[PDB]
Design a protein around this nucleic acid. Structure first.
Ligand SMILES: [Mg+2]
Ligand SMILES: [Mg+2]
Ligand SMILES: [Mg+2]
Ligand SMILES: [Mg+2]
Ligand SMILES: [Mg+2]
Ligand SMILES: [Mg+2]
Ligand SMILES: [Mg+2]
Ligand SMILES: [Mg+2]
Ligand SMILES: [Mg+2]
Ligand SMILES: [Mg+2]
Ligand SMILES: [Mg+2]
Ligand SMILES: [Mg+2]
Ligand SMILES: [Mg+2]
Ligand SMILES: [Mg+2]
Ligand SMILES: [Mg+2]
Ligand SMILES: [Mg+2]
Ligand SMILES: [Mg+2]
Ligand SMILES: [Mg+2]
Ligand SMILES: [Mg+2]
Ligand SMILES: [Mg+2]
Ligand SMILES: [Mg+2]
Ligand SMILES: [Mg+2]
Ligand SMILES: [Mg+2]
Ligand SMILES: [Mg+2]
Ligand SMILES: [Mg+2]
Ligand SMILES: [Mg+2]
Ligand SMILES: [Mg+2]
Ligand SMILES: [Mg+2]
Ligand SMILES: [Mg+2]
Ligand SMILES: [Mg+2]
Ligand SMILES: [Mg+2]
Ligand SMILES: [Mg+2]
Ligand SMILES: [Mg+2]
Ligand SMILES: [Mg+2]
Ligand SMILES: [Mg+2]
Ligand SMILES: [Mg+2]
Lengths: 122, 200, 179, 134, 32
RNA sequence: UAUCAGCUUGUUGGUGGGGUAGUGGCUUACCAAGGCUUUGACGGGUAGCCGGCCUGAGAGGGUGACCGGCCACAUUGGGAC
RNA sequence: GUGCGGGAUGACGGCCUUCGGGUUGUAAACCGCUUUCGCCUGUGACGAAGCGUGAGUGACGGUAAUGGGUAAAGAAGCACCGGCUAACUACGUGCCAGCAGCCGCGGUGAUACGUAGGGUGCGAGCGUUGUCCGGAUUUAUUGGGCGUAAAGGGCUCGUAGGUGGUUGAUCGCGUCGGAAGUGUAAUCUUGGGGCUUAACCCUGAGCGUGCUUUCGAUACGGGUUGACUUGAGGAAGGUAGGG
RNA sequence: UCCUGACGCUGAGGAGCGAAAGCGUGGGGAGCGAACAGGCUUAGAUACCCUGGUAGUCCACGCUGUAAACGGUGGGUACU
RNA sequence: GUGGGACUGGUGAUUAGGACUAAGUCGUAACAAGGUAGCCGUACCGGAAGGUGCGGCUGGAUCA
RNA sequence: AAAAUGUUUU
């Protein structure tokens, strides 16, 4: 565009889409497990991915993935929910922080323990 | 906040003698571990990182402090690699090593941190103390008869003292004629590669 | 060895036939002397070593001189072949080759040791290499600038650049003798 | 209609130099004559001449004769207009532009007449950055 | 142009026009 | 922000009086019909502002913690002493 | 800071194997050293050229600093190892359990899951999440584009606006150059100095990218004013046509 | 040859013009021809093809204001 | 306090289309002359793709 | 001259 066109109407940037609206500017949010279940992934994958409908303290209810082999949380279990997308799962944009509040660390972890909330074993 | 593990493993991984000679570095052509003899690709990052790690494990400096040295050299006028090597050589433990009062830089760090040394009248136990020009490093009077000190006094004649230092071996006194230049630091790394690495 | 070279990129191209696909390998090589002559070669083969060797021997016959004012570019340039735009600027000594992989390989083979190169436009390795190549070919050495303008280097070109050229020539003398 | 006669001069010179023409001609103006003069004094053109009208009998004609070196080699590596009518560019005595790392010349119209950057910097005077001929 | 783009837009437009034709009365009773 | 186009009647100006530390529609009486606006008035949304901070080759982009300057507020609303 | 030098007999044990061995590994064992920090104990401030008529007067505070003693001891974890991306194998599992930032991995030989050995990057931290800038020239003033990739209004007229052929004179608003004032301090850049070094702190200068005042310059932009005809329009004559 | 003497260019918003189909009032209606009816084809044929055939196509005055309204290329100017 | 408006959030029987998923059913509309060249605007018709009329385009072609 | 269609391996 001409300089006069830029003067009359300047450049405008893009919108910069948000990824995790339910957190509302917080690194993680507390919630209650309104439902605990399993979901079949999208193709080409195939499994029984463990997820939970959680009512976060922001008043929004979202689906959160439960990582790691092992699971204890059930109905009305208080959880901490952080960001994180599961690619082969449409509509899952949050994960549950293992080792925090009611959810507990994965039992037999010995590598990458901190990411699954497993205390070091003597 | 100090590497205490084996140094021959690091020398073998980096492909060069980090310190010493006539040792377990007869297994030099391959890094440590089960997968040592395989052929390597060596990307540019790989090469750069190797040069940076060579300098780091040679001088006993961890990553945060090495990075700080890098920004200081980059801000300084002149060649960035020259200034970085000049800083690393101006470190006090390296000064003791180069003067030859220590068998190795690790021994120099040991004695410096233990305080067996005086800097122009004032006691210093900081290995990273940057020695300035015309400085006078002195052995502590109490510790003028350390076993490592007497070994160095027996062996220094074989050792080569750089032109920017004057040493009164038996007296334990390292006079700093001037802050060293690239031609005076021994060429064993690629400071240019390190500088390129710290730009990606 | 005598001539320093980098393999910029290799690609697995295929030709579909009635039976199936006939795969092949393409090789970009940059071969230079490290002092000002450099070239790039494209190689086609069924095998990586054959493609690389063909590219190298094709690059040998495409060596063009690059004007270095003491281990650095003479003056800023912007080259572009097809869609590969590459910007080059000279840098103070000790800056290094601040360039992307392919352009950095081209510059390192050409012998430039202090240069700032940016890759605008497409990121395809071949096109970026050609853009770096014609950016270097656009370089115009100060004596030939003076010949172009019918004047003298002391009348056309910056005193700092000329001086730095003299000190670079002096370190050259140093190395030579030392040998 | 014509908007920037200086840009017209620059593009005429660029096109003629590219097409290897020995001479180019244009309607004359004082600023065009000054730019041609400093181009000649800096060695980018062989010569220039202002001609009294005898074909159109209407106005003076400025004619630039260009120079090509041995083996038909361009003496002009390019010319660019900086201070456009749509957006004008003024440079201070300290922020004077450098062209081709100093090899080329920026033509700056200062309060003391047309002066190449080098000149201006010597006189510590800025002005309107007309061109970047190199 | 691959004509596929025009075909996609054609189908979207035709479906919307069919929706307008089937809901013509309700819109004029209450709405656009 | 135009998917807000009209806004204002002490409003705009004048004269006399009053008031105030002080100029002033600040206030008052009378007279006039102005004032603002597609170069965005009025309305909606958000927000204390800045020295600075982070990032960036720069131009810019984001931001307004500590520290320092100005402003606003002190249970909410109003009022004076 | 968690040690330093020496130490091949390259020990056992793990792990791998082509059962040859390789690897962990100078690592250990073993030998000789050193005592920073921690712990024990002694000495013990500056800040006060203050204050108070004097006597006296430090909250921090037995603090910092420092002498002596102890034992190589009281002191290392976290992430990662398919590509980007530094670093690979075995066992278990068998589109299950699970992984993932993207590409993707897992369907019986998984360097991508889980564990182990080995390794790599960092290290009193290491990862994850959130947010911002960068990379993104991906709003392009620097620094992009619109035949077919996203992008020329269906076409014209025309208002505001933007823009302006040659030249004389003049103004000096833009523009350019000095001077004065201002841009507190801190920050920031940089020169010196102090804390054992550093962070941090003090100090000199720069910066403070502007603004105001004032004195100059007049090439260009613009204002005022006067010319010129080549752009533009008109007259006269000629003239083509499914306007 | 003559005249005026930069009066130029572009133009947001605005206004006008804008194929065909369509709409309103009135007229006209040969041919053509959505819809429609029938015959064929077909697994079906709400199609192609065939026989019929109403709006429309035409006129007057309005309305609508959209097209692959395309050179998918905005206007002006100079040069090569 | 009273009254009439303005703006706006949640919710709503019912209803509309969008996106994704069986490896469901119905045809085959497009891509080759896609078997009636395709597409643009508009109009009417039809379970659905689509069919047809009118004008236009080549981002179609036959035959030169 | 009309003459339709082609699930889910690993
Ligand atoms: Mg291009
Ligand atoms: Mg009054
Ligand atoms: Mg607020
Ligand atoms: Mg702000
Ligand atoms: Mg404050
Ligand atoms: Mg690798
Ligand atoms: Mg297995
Ligand atoms: Mg950007
Ligand atoms: Mg980003
Ligand atoms: Mg683009
Ligand atoms: Mg254009
Ligand atoms: Mg397009
Ligand atoms: Mg058009
Ligand atoms: Mg329109
Ligand atoms: Mg106008
Ligand atoms: Mg003009
Ligand atoms: Mg004049
Ligand atoms: Mg300061
Ligand atoms: Mg100091
Ligand atoms: Mg300041
Ligand atoms: Mg004027
Ligand atoms: Mg006529
Ligand atoms: Mg006249
Ligand atoms: Mg209109
Ligand atoms: Mg019609
Ligand atoms: Mg009709
Ligand atoms: Mg009728
Ligand atoms: Mg029919
Ligand atoms: Mg048309
Ligand atoms: Mg269009
Ligand atoms: Mg237009
Ligand atoms: Mg044009
Ligand atoms: Mg509902
Ligand atoms: Mg079909
Ligand atoms: Mg068809
Ligand atoms: Mg029909």
């Amino acid at each position: 565009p001409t300089i006069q066109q830029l003067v009359r109407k300047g450049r405008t940037d893009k919108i910069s889409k948000n990824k995790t609206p339910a957190l509302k500017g917080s690194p993680q949010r507390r919630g209650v497990c309104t439902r605990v279940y399993t979901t079949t992934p999208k193709k080409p994958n195939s499994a029984l991915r463990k997820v939970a409908r959680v009512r976060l303290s922001s008043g929004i209810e979202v689906t959160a993935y439960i990582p790691g082999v092992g699971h204890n949380l059930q109905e009305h279990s208080m959880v901490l929910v952080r960001g994180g997308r599961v690619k082969d799962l449409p509509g899952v944009r949050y994960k549950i922080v293992r080792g925090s509040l009611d959810t507990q660390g994965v039992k037999g972890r010995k590598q990458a323990r901190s990411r699954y909330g497993a205390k070091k074993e003597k | 906040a100090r590497y205490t593990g084996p140094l021959t493993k690091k020398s073998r991984r980096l492909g060069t003698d980090l310190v010493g000679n006539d040792k377990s570095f007869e297994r030099r052509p391959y890094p440590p571990g089960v997968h040592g003899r395989g052929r390597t690709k060596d990307s540019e990052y790989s090469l750069q990182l190797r040069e940076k790690q060579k300098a780091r494990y040679a001088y006993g400096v961890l990553e945060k402090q090495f990075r700080r040295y890098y920004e200081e050299a980059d801000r300084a006028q002149g060649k960035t690699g020259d200034v970085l090597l000049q800083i690393l050589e101006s470190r006090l433990d390296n000064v003791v090593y180069r003067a030859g009062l220590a068998a190795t830089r690790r021994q120099a760090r040991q004695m410096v941190s233990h305080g067996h040394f005086l800097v122009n009248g004032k006691k210093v136990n900081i290995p990273s103390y940057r020695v300035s020009t015309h400085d006078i490093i002195d052995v502590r009077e109490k510790s003028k008869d350390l076993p490592p000190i007497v070994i160095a006094r027996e062996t220094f004649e074989t050792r080569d003292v750089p032109a920017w230092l004057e040493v009164r071996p038996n007296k334990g006194r390292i006079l700093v004629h001037q802050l060293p230049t690239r031609d005076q630091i021994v060429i064993d790394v690629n400071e240019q590669a390190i500088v390129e690495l710290y730009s990606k | 060895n005598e001539y320093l070279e980098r393999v910029v990129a290799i690609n697995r191209v295929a030709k579909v036939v009635q039976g199936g696909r006939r795969f092949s390998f393409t090789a970009l090589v940059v071969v230079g002397d490290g002092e000002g002559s450099v070239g790039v070669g494209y190689g086609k083969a069924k095998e990586v070593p054959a493609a690389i060797a063909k590219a190298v021997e094709e690059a040998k016959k495409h060596f063009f001189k690059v004007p270095l004012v003491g281990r650095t570019i003479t003056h800023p340039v912007i080259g572009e072949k097809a869609a590969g735009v590459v910007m080059l600027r000279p840098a103070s000594p000790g800056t290094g080759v601040i360039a992307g992989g392919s352009a950095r390989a081209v510059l390192e083979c050409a012998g430039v040791h202090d240069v700032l190169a940016k890759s605008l436009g497409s990121s395809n390795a071949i096109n970026v290499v050609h853009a770096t190549v014609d950016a270097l070919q656009q370089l115009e050495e100060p004596e030939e600038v003076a010949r172009r303008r019918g004047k003298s280097v002391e009348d056309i070109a910056p005193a700092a650049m000329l001086r730095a050229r003299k000190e670079a020539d002096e370190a050259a003398a140093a190395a030579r003798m030392e040998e | 209609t014509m908007t920037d006669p200086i840009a017209d001069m620059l593009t005429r010179l660029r096109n003629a130099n590219q097409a290897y023409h020995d001479q180019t001609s244009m309607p004359h103006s004082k600023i065009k004559a000054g730019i041609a003069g400093i181009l000649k004094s800096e060695g980018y053109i062989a010569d220039y001449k202002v001609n009294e009208p005898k074909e159109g009998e209407v106005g003076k004609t400025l004619t630039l004769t260009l120079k090509y070196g041995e083996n038909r080699e361009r003496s002009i590596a390019g010319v660019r207009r900086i201070s456009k009518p749509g957006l004008r560019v003024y440079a201070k005595s300290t922020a004077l532009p450098k062209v081709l790392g100093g090899l080329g010349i920026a033509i700056i119209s200062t309060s003391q007449g047309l002066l190449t950057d080098k000149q201006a910097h010597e006189k510590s005077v800025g002005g309107e950055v007309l061109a970047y001929v190199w | 142009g691959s004509v596929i783009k025009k075909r996609r837009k054609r189908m979207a437009k035709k479906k919307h026009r069919k929706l307008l034709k089937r809901t013509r009365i309700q819109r004029r009773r209450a709405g656009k």
